[model samples]
Target: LLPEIFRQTVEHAPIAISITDLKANILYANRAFRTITGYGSEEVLGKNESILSNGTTPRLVYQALWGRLAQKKPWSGVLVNRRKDKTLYLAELTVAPVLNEAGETIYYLGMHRDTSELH
Candidate 1:
């Protein structure tokens, strides 16, 4: 059973959060995610995380990101993404692999914080 504590915590957390399946299809997004990317749950569900990519972020970054994921490692790096309104935000993106009891990576928890103000 999904714990209410976990649900409430992420829902109210200030940082953006998203959960995606192994193929990178978004399954859940917190309010902070919607507020940061201008994307709603309805719009993002079943969509790839690439939906937020604006083509400005280097391809090499993605190669490295996946390389780490393939090793079942967490990846933390900067992401320059475009909002739904076409505005850009520099985000500190972190993706951690979620493993099951069988020690298989089943999903990914993506957390992002807007770093534009800090930059």
Candidate 2:
């Protein structure tokens, strides 16, 4: 019950949330993610996080982001992301590594909001 309860908590949250595998392949996405990214569950599940990448962000940014994740740290930054309709938006994103009791990373939890209107 606690598991489903917490799942529902995330599902109903206003922020876009996604759970991905180590390689960044999306395993789950919430309703807010669908609303903000214009992607449906059927389409986005199993897709790479790069699906939202606009391809303009610098390579160094990813290098830094990955570095932090490898260190089991969370990272937050703004990125240019493209919606399913190909519209670009500024996404304020935070990603955290989900580790098992053994301290091995098993998944990534990502949360983001569209900040295009603000800046």
Candidate 3:
């Protein structure tokens, strides 16, 4: 169970926070994510994360990420993502598989930090 404080912190954080399914479909997104990506909750939920892909992230990066998740491992990397207005931004992303009590992977937690200034 996520502590209320932790949930509050993540919801109001300055950086973006998003969670997805194994198929890369977005499930939950925080306010910061909505603000930065110019997408409302209604528009983002149930959508694929590929909506943000800018074509700058190499195919190998996605391949490696999926490979790690298939092994039930966590993965982190930088990616170029596009906003609703087609503005490109660099983001540091951390993805981890959410497992169930039976050790089966359930979902993916994708925590993102805007790194546009670093680019």
Candidate 4:
């Protein structure tokens, strides 16, 4: 279980965040995530992260993201994604692959910030 302070920090972030299993099944979604995508934890739990992709993000970006994850590396980029309301927004996303002691990937931690109106 996560410590209270760690959970509190994530919950208080300005960006959206979600934790997922190695297979990309959602496990946790912070409050900021609900505000950004209008999806609650219940709605996203056990769902693949792709559920938010509306095809506006280039296929090549996904390819690169997966490639880096396979290499056990972190990836950061901007992509377009759809919210539960079907509205698209530009997002700056970062995905970090978490590994076990055995060096096998265990989970993915993803953070996203809306950048639709950014300069």
Which structure among the candidates has the greatest TM-score? Answer: 2
Q: What is the lDDT of residue 85 in candidate 1?
A: 85
lDDT of 3 by residue, 1-119 (tens): 66988888888988898888889899888999988888998989957888888688888888888899889999999888899988889889888999999989999888888776632
What candidate 1 gets wrong by more than 4 Å, as runs, is none
Lowest summed lDDT over 10 consecutive residues: which window, candidate 3?
A: 110-119
lDDT of each: 0.87, 0.89, 0.86, 0.87
Sorting all predicted structures by lDDT, with the top scorer first, yields 2, 1, 4, 3
Candidate 4 contains a number of clashing pairs equal to 0
Give the per-residue lDDT digits (tens) of candidate 4, residues 24-116: 888998988888887876787857888888787889999899899989999999999888888889999999998999988889999999876
Question: Comparing candidate 1 with candidate 2, which one achieves the higher lDDT?
Answer: 2
TM-score versus the correct structure, for each prediction: 0.91, 0.92, 0.87, 0.89
Off by over 4 Å in 2: none
Superposed by TM-score, candidate 3 places the C-alpha of residue 102 at a distance from the truth, in angstroms, of: 2.2
Off by over 4 Å in 3: 1-5, 117-119
lDDT of 2 at 9: 96
8: Cα error in model 4, Å: 1.8
Superior candidate under TM-score, 1 versus 2: 2
- Give the Cα-based TM-score of candidate 2 against the true structure: 0.92
Model 2 lDDT vs. the true structure? Answer: 0.89
lDDT (Cα, 0-100) at 21 in candidate 1? 89
